[PDB]
Structure 1
Amino acid sequence: KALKYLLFQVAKMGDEKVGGVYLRNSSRFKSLKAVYDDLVKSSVSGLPYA
């Protein structure tokens, strides 16, 4: 549950700059999703049917 919530939480944020400090977040979601679908969404459980 928390991982699904965290996807939404990360997708929302964007780059920000205050004097001297600059944080870039626009690239986090790409990596996070690429890892998520590979390690969780693709894991099959149960059995097929014939």
Structure 2
Amino acid sequence: KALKYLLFQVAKMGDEKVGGVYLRNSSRFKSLKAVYDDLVKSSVSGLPYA
């Protein structure tokens, strides 16, 4: 539940630059999603059925 919530928060975040400090948040969801699908979604939790 927390991990799904983290994905939502990361997506909404945007690129911010207040004078002196800069923070590119754009290229985080792209990276985060790839791990998420690979290590969480693409992992069966049961048995198939013939």
**Which range, TM-score by smaller chain?**
over 0.9
**Consecutive aligned runs of 4 or more in structure 1 exceeding 3 Å deviation:** none
| Matched residues, number | 50
Q: Deviations over 1:20-41 (max 9, x none)?
A: 1111110000000000000000
SS of the counterpart of 2:31? helix
TM-score by length of 2: 0.94
User: Which structure is higher in helix share?
Assistant: 2
RMSD: 0.6
TM norm structure 1: 0.94
> Which consecutive unaligned segments of at least 5 residues does structure 1 have?
none
Residue ranges of structure 2 left out of the alignment (5+ in a row): none
**Percentage of identical aligned residues:** 100
